């Protein structure tokens, strides 16, 4: 059972594709954010989060993503492996991106502060 | 580079050299570097309608028509890639001439020295 900090560090390294030494500032920022008191998530109820996600997807005319989400939610509920379904649903909702909206390519301008 | 362009813009707007606007540049870099929640509206037409409504609310119907015409021209020109974002920015920076600018109290100047 790898400590959550080590697992998060490995996840960050894997997702960004950089060594631990190159992500030190980002690691510090992440540690500060995770240790910082964050306001409660918009929805902490599994059924309320699922309903809000469905309503948001239908309102955005993203029916395919809504169907995929409904299927994944049904599978998660039937599998019964996750103890805190509401937390996972809230995370997925927070990470949802509209596939129709072209990913806002982070302007090169962010690089000015990196130095 | 976008950073150099922003610096030149700041220098031009403030009328000071790049060296005199270093703190404002740092503040801008900090603001831009902060993670922002997704914008409320990413649709060009919704932003245009909001801008028109905001201009009408200030009883500036002529300015509202001028804004609608300029927005139509910008959309047809196709030079801007993110029309909704630019329209939202312009609406957000619009000021009602009837609403007296909340004059930054002279007291802020006391600490500048």
């Amino acid at each position: 059972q790898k400590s959550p900090n080590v697992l998060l560090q490995n996840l960050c390294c894997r997702i960004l594709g950089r060594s631990e030494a190159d992500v030190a500032q980002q690691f510090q920022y992440a540690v500060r954010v995770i240790g910082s008191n964050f306001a409660p998530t918009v929805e902490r109820d599994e059924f309320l989060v699922a309903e809000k996600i469905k309503k948001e997807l239908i309102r955005q005319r993203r029916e395919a993503d809504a169907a995929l989400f409904s299927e994944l939610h049904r599978k998660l509920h039937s599998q019964g492996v996750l103890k805190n379904k509401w937390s996972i649903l809230y995370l997925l909702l927070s990470l949802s991106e509209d596939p129709r909206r072209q990913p806002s390519k982070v302007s090169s301008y962010a690089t000015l502060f990196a130095q | 580079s976008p950073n150099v362009l922003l610096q030149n813009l700041c220098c031009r707007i403030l009328g000071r050299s790049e060296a005199d606007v270093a703190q404002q540049f740092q503040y801008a870099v900090r603001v831009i570097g902060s993670n922002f929640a997704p914008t409320v509206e990413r649709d060009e037409f919704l932003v245009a309608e909001k801008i028109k409504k905001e201009l009408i609310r200030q009883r500036r119907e002529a300015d509202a028509a001028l804004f609608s015409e300029l927005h139509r021209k910008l959309h047809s020109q196709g030079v801007l890639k993110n029309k909704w974002s630019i329209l939202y920015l312009l609406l957000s920076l619009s000021e009602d001439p009837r609403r007296q600018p909340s004059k930054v109290s002279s007291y802020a100047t006391l600490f500048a020295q």
């Binding site: 918009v42 309503k55 927070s94 | 929640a37």
Partner: peptide, 28 residues
């Protein structure tokens, strides 16, 4: 008088709008 169905619809719409606003504020 707003019918029970119309009353329920208006209540649900207001609740949805307020939930969306609360969610947006929480995310912000």
């Amino acid at each position: 008088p707003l019918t029970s169905i119309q009353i329920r619809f208006i209540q649900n719409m207001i609740q949805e709008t307020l939930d969306d606003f609360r969610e947006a504020c929480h995310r912000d």
